[PDB]
Amino acid sequence: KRPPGFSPF
């Protein structure tokens, strides 16, 4: 769902 390169947590 979230975009590419999303940070952890």
Side-chain angles (χ1 to χ4, degrees):
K1 201 260 164 149
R2 265 218 201 168
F6 70 93
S7 252
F9 238 110

